[PDB]
Design an enzyme around this catalytic site. Structure first.
Site, PDB file in Angstrom:
ATOM      1  N   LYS A 221       0.982 -10.214   7.392  1.00 33.73           N
ATOM      2  CA  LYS A 221       1.297  -8.614   7.720  1.00 33.73           C
ATOM      3  C   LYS A 221      -0.040  -8.212   8.402  1.00 33.73           C
ATOM      4  O   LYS A 221      -1.040  -8.189   7.914  1.00 33.73           O
ATOM      5  CB  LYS A 221       1.924  -8.106   6.387  1.00 33.73           C
ATOM      6  CG  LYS A 221       1.746  -6.434   6.848  1.00 33.73           C
ATOM      7  CD  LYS A 221       2.110  -5.775   5.564  1.00 33.73           C
ATOM      8  CE  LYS A 221       1.907  -4.305   6.156  1.00 33.73           C
ATOM      9  NZ  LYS A 221       2.104  -3.328   4.810  1.00 33.73           N
TER      10      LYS A 221
ATOM     11  N   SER B 211       0.773  -1.110  -0.121  1.00 31.96           N
ATOM     12  CA  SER B 211       0.044  -0.072  -0.099  1.00 31.96           C
ATOM     13  C   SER B 211       0.727   1.150  -0.111  1.00 31.96           C
ATOM     14  O   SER B 211       0.755   2.304  -0.676  1.00 31.96           O
ATOM     15  CB  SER B 211      -1.057   0.006   1.412  1.00 31.96           C
ATOM     16  OG  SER B 211      -1.675  -1.078   1.349  1.00 31.96           O
ATOM     17  N   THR B 212       1.809   1.423   0.878  1.00 31.62           N
ATOM     18  CA  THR B 212       2.828   2.608   0.969  1.00 31.62           C
ATOM     19  C   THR B 212       3.576   2.692  -0.593  1.00 31.62           C
ATOM     20  O   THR B 212       4.045   3.863  -0.678  1.00 31.62           O
ATOM     21  CB  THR B 212       3.764   2.268   1.901  1.00 31.62           C
ATOM     22  OG1 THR B 212       3.229   1.715   3.191  1.00 31.62           O
ATOM     23  CG2 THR B 212       4.932   3.346   2.323  1.00 31.62           C
TER      24      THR B 212
ATOM     25  N   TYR C 294      -1.559 -10.657   3.585  1.00 38.24           N
ATOM     26  CA  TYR C 294      -1.470  -9.126   3.897  1.00 38.24           C
ATOM     27  C   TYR C 294      -3.107  -8.682   4.331  1.00 38.24           C
ATOM     28  O   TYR C 294      -3.773  -8.779   3.914  1.00 38.24           O
ATOM     29  CB  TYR C 294      -1.032  -8.193   2.912  1.00 38.24           C
ATOM     30  CG  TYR C 294      -1.086  -6.722   3.201  1.00 38.24           C
ATOM     31  CD1 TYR C 294      -1.435  -6.121   4.343  1.00 38.24           C
ATOM     32  CD2 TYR C 294      -1.084  -5.890   2.121  1.00 38.24           C
ATOM     33  CE1 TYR C 294      -1.335  -4.639   4.608  1.00 38.24           C
ATOM     34  CE2 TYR C 294      -1.057  -4.708   2.193  1.00 38.24           C
ATOM     35  CZ  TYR C 294      -1.280  -3.958   3.530  1.00 38.24           C
ATOM     36  OH  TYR C 294      -1.249  -2.816   3.474  1.00 38.24           O
TER      37      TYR C 294
ATOM     38  N   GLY D  59       1.684  -4.248  11.385  1.00 35.64           N
ATOM     39  CA  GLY D  59       1.901  -3.399  10.171  1.00 35.64           C
ATOM     40  C   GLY D  59       1.380  -1.895  10.957  1.00 35.64           C
ATOM     41  O   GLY D  59       1.385  -0.964  10.015  1.00 35.64           O
TER      42      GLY D  59
ATOM     43  N   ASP E 245       3.076   0.885  12.775  1.00 32.07           N
ATOM     44  CA  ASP E 245       4.196   1.522  13.476  1.00 32.07           C
ATOM     45  C   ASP E 245       4.130   2.236  14.683  1.00 32.07           C
ATOM     46  O   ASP E 245       5.017   2.110  15.802  1.00 32.07           O
ATOM     47  CB  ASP E 245       4.795   2.486  12.518  1.00 32.07           C
ATOM     48  CG  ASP E 245       4.942   2.117  11.197  1.00 32.07           C
ATOM     49  OD1 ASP E 245       4.411   0.929  10.515  1.00 32.07           O
ATOM     50  OD2 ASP E 245       5.559   3.026  10.264  1.00 32.07           O
ATOM     51  N   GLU E 246       2.881   2.777  15.000  1.00 34.97           N
ATOM     52  CA  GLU E 246       2.557   3.531  16.188  1.00 34.97           C
ATOM     53  C   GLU E 246       2.206   2.753  17.290  1.00 34.97           C
ATOM     54  O   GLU E 246       1.885   3.120  18.483  1.00 34.97           O
ATOM     55  CB  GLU E 246       1.554   4.843  15.805  1.00 34.97           C
ATOM     56  CG  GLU E 246       0.211   4.262  15.380  1.00 34.97           C
ATOM     57  CD  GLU E 246       0.143   4.158  13.648  1.00 34.97           C
ATOM     58  OE1 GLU E 246       0.994   3.246  13.378  1.00 34.97           O
ATOM     59  OE2 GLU E 246      -0.572   5.186  13.013  1.00 34.97           O
TER      60      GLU E 246
HETATM   61  C1  LIG Z   1       2.209  -2.049   4.483  1.00 38.20           C
HETATM   62  C2  LIG Z   1       2.734  -1.022   5.463  1.00 38.20           C
HETATM   63  C3  LIG Z   1       1.473  -0.707   6.425  1.00 38.20           C
HETATM   64  O1  LIG Z   1       0.402  -1.203   5.853  1.00 38.20           O
HETATM   65  O2  LIG Z   1       1.711  -1.370   7.578  1.00 38.20           O
HETATM   66  C4  LIG Z   1       0.843   0.770   6.626  1.00 38.20           C
HETATM   67  N1  LIG Z   1      -0.396   0.827   6.723  1.00 38.20           N
HETATM   68  C5  LIG Z   1      -1.382   2.040   6.802  1.00 38.20           C
HETATM   69  C6  LIG Z   1      -2.494   1.904   7.652  1.00 38.20           C
HETATM   70  O3  LIG Z   1      -1.050   2.894   5.976  1.00 38.20           O
HETATM   71  C7  LIG Z   1       1.490   1.436   8.194  1.00 38.20           C
HETATM   72  O4  LIG Z   1       3.090   1.393   8.036  1.00 38.20           O
HETATM   73  C8  LIG Z   1       1.427   2.992   8.259  1.00 38.20           C
HETATM   74  O5  LIG Z   1       1.454   3.573   7.033  1.00 38.20           O
HETATM   75  C9  LIG Z   1       1.732   3.446   9.698  1.00 38.20           C
HETATM   76  O6  LIG Z   1       1.403   2.541  10.860  1.00 38.20           O
HETATM   77  C10 LIG Z   1       0.969   4.882   9.998  1.00 38.20           C
HETATM   78  O7  LIG Z   1      -0.386   4.677  10.115  1.00 38.20           O
HETATM   79  C11 LIG Z   1       1.944  -1.658   3.173  1.00 38.20           C
HETATM   80  O8  LIG Z   1       2.341  -0.566   2.948  1.00 38.20           O
HETATM   81  O9  LIG Z   1       1.817  -2.635   2.465  1.00 38.20           O
END
Ligand SMILES: *[C@H](CC(O)(O)[C@@H](NC(C)=O)[C@@H](O)[C@H](O)[C@H](O)CO)C(=O)O
Ligand SMILES: *[C@H](CC(O)(O)[C@@H](NC(C)=O)[C@@H](O)[C@H](O)[C@H](O)CO)C(=O)O
Ligand SMILES: *[C@H](CC(=O)[C@@H](NC(C)=O)[C@@H](O)[C@H](O)[C@H](O)CO)C(=O)O
Ligand SMILES: *[C@H](CC(=O)[C@@H](NC(C)=O)[C@@H](O)[C@H](O)[C@H](O)CO)C(=O)O
Ligand SMILES: [Cl-]
Ligand SMILES: [Cl-]
Lengths: 285, 285, 293, 293
Positions: C164, C47-48, C136, C188, C190-191
């Site tokens: 994930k 997604s990122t 995922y 998944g 980070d916070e």
């Molecule tokens: C996986 C990365 C992620 O899906 O874990 C990110 N997800 C979201 C909710 O955007 C995650 O790192 C967040 O960006 C972060 O915790 C801030 O909310 C991927 O990108 O497939």
């Protein structure tokens, strides 16, 4: 029993600044609905009456006042539902004693109840009072289970699901349905609901009746015009604060509709009063 | 006031078949928590006590019995929240009079209240009783607004949002947090919550304390092992019916925990009793 | 197999003003992650990476570029999931051919797929590529919620290695470790790294590790050693940064933070807003000064 | 412009066992809609066409086939929306070149796009193709809820003609007609055709019209003439059929119903279950006997 079809205002209650019932104001609200809004009946003790923020004794006082003021001029339904089933039975017995035409009860809330618990709740209110019952909005099989009790007359339908509404009218043709969403009266009436229970009928009962009657006659373009004006008014009411705006509109008609009950904001701000004045000028003058 | 950190069982209440309070059973439940579960305190009148299905007088009887049975042996918090603010004030005044260490109140429910209405509700309970208050789970700015009242001590945290939990502990370090989800005690304790309030501590207080203490010492692998066994037990409890299964488990320990209060199913089926027997054999023997 | 535990950045992709991939910028993002963020690996095409707004050919180009730049220095996971199962198979074969260590796939979305359909989707990607798979799970974007019994059915396929995990459900997270202790879990969110690490997750895949990988590794390793007070302090500083990133616009703020480090992280891809406003740029600089200085 | 009001079937697509398009079968589905269902037009490439599981080239093939088979006998609307805005533009240009009467596009999904991003997406598709646009709103699958003020912003672009409405919100539906009386609305919920027609919708786009178009036209025309009792009776029979179709599996049941009419409607496309079970086939035959005989 008495005919329960048609237009029922969900009765608003007038409260004093201190939160107590303003009896004179409540009687003026009742007279306004019967004499000016020309309702078929009143639904007393529902959400619109700020019922759930009140004591059992306050609910009883409201049931007494409304029945004494309305007498036999219109049909009267008493909403006695609660999270406390013993309280629902106690209120149901008292409303039955006062001569209410039928009871109604919200599904028990706060906890998550299973369907069997919900059916047992309705069967108990009915068994202990001897009165007929109008349920609240569950799917078609569950309504069928509730309708196994011959004293369940039908439902005050609030779900915004017109597929379910059609299914219910087809599957249980002899059970009644009252639309619970004033802003969707036309589409509900197009599917043959038997009446409507609503908060906005306290001030917009003329248009509500017109919509209902025009729709049953198949005069859909005209009904839609009146629903459009009605919904402009409802949109303003919802944005400004639903119960306070209806009360402020009633004050403009000389009805002492009072304050709301706390924990709801009790006193209308100057801005809320100004908006009610504008709404009256535009839609109720 | 008295130290309110640590492990608080959300007190279950014993009811008779007819729905009335079984006082002897309630006192046995209290003694079980103090003497065998070794709790730091009891949270009386909360969701777990089947409080919201009861009359004001029944709530008062439960507050009286629990304080008389517990005396000054443990800390006691009284949940007095309601949709009726006058009832919340009345219960808050009575619990304060009985000597409860602090009050707590669920956010007013059934209607949708705005944040200002919710803050006014808490400020009113505090102003009218003179007691400190523990709120229920709103975001960081709203907790800050509630914390402007120096008599708000902190929150019984139920939201499954560990980002918000971290933010709250960072932004308001001197305010307390009690984890409200027994099955997530470890991760909550890893973020420094001050204690936990929970229904399952009525029978699993030994493991709960172990998890909390091991986690604060950084002994996360061992804490996780105990959380795994605890959650196998909680999983069975939730599937079988939460309050009835805890009561059936208490009966197996010789505690007259009685029936549940209607509109909840009051009597455990044979299948529910069999499952409780299996759960006791596997996890509490 | 090449070890997949640890810290993985969900690779961000640099786009030109017209939306095409900025290859030079993407290589700088990769270098920054390997050399400065000290990641264990990259999760490419997630997604990122703005993956779901791209064409199949664009996805292949990003996969080629990331493998060519990273070579064998780190672990590499390729997210190849899609609503189109033939596309997922095509991408999985291509990432397998390129030498990616493992595949990953978002649960199929848009349509309301049944569990059996979801399970057939994972089994097909695996069977057609011969590669291992990481489920995922991101219910907040897909609306797909799988319970513990459903993970069990997925794990009946021995090539499904773990998940994930992004649900905000720490009860489910605990249940996964209880039931399938040898299956892997990557946090998944980070916070919420600290509490997820308290429950034994095996690593983390995240967008903020593209700029905060040093702190992210500290939180993870300190929590595993039981040093909660120290870990919590670093999670607190991390979450002040993340709060600011989220308020200013996640994708765009991480790219602007990378540009302040000399990485040509470029624009976002449309339909996301492609260019940062002056206010977003100013806030990124303030966040960099406070937290990444 | 070629009139877009009335009854539109959301065109179903016939797939072979391997997932490729069955061109002969697709032409039979189109013929069945034009000749027997008596539709005013077809909505091609929508959710009902299994569009979001396909490649860009497959989508182009379906567009070519539908226009070549229908020629100029009916109105044709091409749904070209996607998470990939470059793909939506590519498909919109191609459908415009083929002679489609209007474009339509689902709100961009998966990612949480802001309203401004959604508005830029529609404005870009329109600007790059020069074609008119129908917003496709389906909150149940996308999670995107747009309020009345947001529709107003979209309608600031004069080439946005209206909306394919599927929300189960008849208050919003009424508000749309109040505020933008000259903008068009097509009901997207076949089981709620009567109440939507009571509020003045201009037509309907639906999957069940591929087999129940006769009844669907009756409900619509009877409701507009104020014949509520008659319309309700036909909505009741229709909804018994729809209830059965939904319980047995929507896509597969409509295709099986079409096969019983001699239309080679084929298989569904994977990740949806591609083949009907014996029980699903038996139920389709019972539904056909009861309602389409
Ligand atoms: C996986 C990365 C992620 O899906 O874990 C990110 N997800 C979201 C909710 O955007 C995650 O790192 C967040 O960006 C972060 O915790 C801030 O909310 C991927 O990108 O497939
Ligand atoms: C548009 C057609 C549709 O989106 O309106 C269909 N939607 C859904 C919810 O599947 C609709 O016809 C339903 O299939 C029908 O009412 C039964 O629920 C399109 O396919 O793009
Ligand atoms: C019945 C109330 C009722 O039908 C109202 N419901 C709600 C949520 O307010 C309804 O009239 C509403 O006020 C209007 O439709 C405006 O939205 C009862 O028990 O009071
Ligand atoms: C507080 C109760 C409380 O925290 C419980 N909440 C719920 C929803 O049951 C919690 O202990 C729960 O029973 C267990 O975590 C099991 O899920 C109160 O007022 O009682
Ligand atoms: Cl009936
Ligand atoms: Cl503080």
């Amino acid at each position: 029993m008495r005919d329960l079809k048609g237009i029922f205002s969900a009765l608003l209650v007038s409260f004093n600044e201190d939160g107590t019932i303003n009896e004179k104001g409540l009687r003026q609200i009742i007279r306004h609905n019967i004499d000016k809004m020309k309702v078929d009946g009143l639904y007393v003790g529902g959400s619109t009456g700020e019922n759930f923020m009140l004591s059992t004794e306050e609910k009883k006082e409201i049931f007494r006042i409304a029945k004494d003021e309305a007498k036999d001029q219109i049909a009267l339904i008493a909403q006695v539902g609660s999270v406390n089933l013993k309280e629902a039975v106690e209120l149901g017995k008292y409303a039955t004693e006062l001569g209410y035409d039928c009871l109604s009860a919200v599904t028990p809330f706060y906890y998550k109840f299973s369907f069997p618990e919900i059916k047992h709740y309705y069967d108990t209110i009915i068994a202990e009072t001897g009165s007929n019952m109008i349920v609240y909005s569950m799917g078609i099989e569950q309504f069928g289970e509730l309708y196994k009790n011959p004293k369940v007359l039908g439902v005050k339908f609030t779900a915004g699901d017109f597929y379910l509404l059609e299914r219910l009218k087809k599957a249980y043709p002899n059970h009644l349905i009252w639309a619970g969403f004033d802003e969707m009266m036309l589409p509900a009436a197009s599917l043959g609901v038997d009446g409507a229970i609503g908060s906005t009928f306290n001030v917009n009962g003329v248009r509500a009746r017109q919509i209902f009657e025009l729709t049953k006659a198949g005069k859909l373009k005209e009904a839609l015009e009146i629903q459009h004006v009605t919904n402009d008014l409802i949109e303003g009411i919802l944005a400004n604060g639903l119960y306070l705006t209806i009360k402020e509109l009633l004050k403009l008609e000389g009805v002492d509709a009072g304050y709301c009950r706390e924990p709801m904001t009790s006193k209308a701000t100057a801005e809320q009063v100004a908006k009610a004045k504008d709404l009256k000028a535009k839609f109720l003058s």
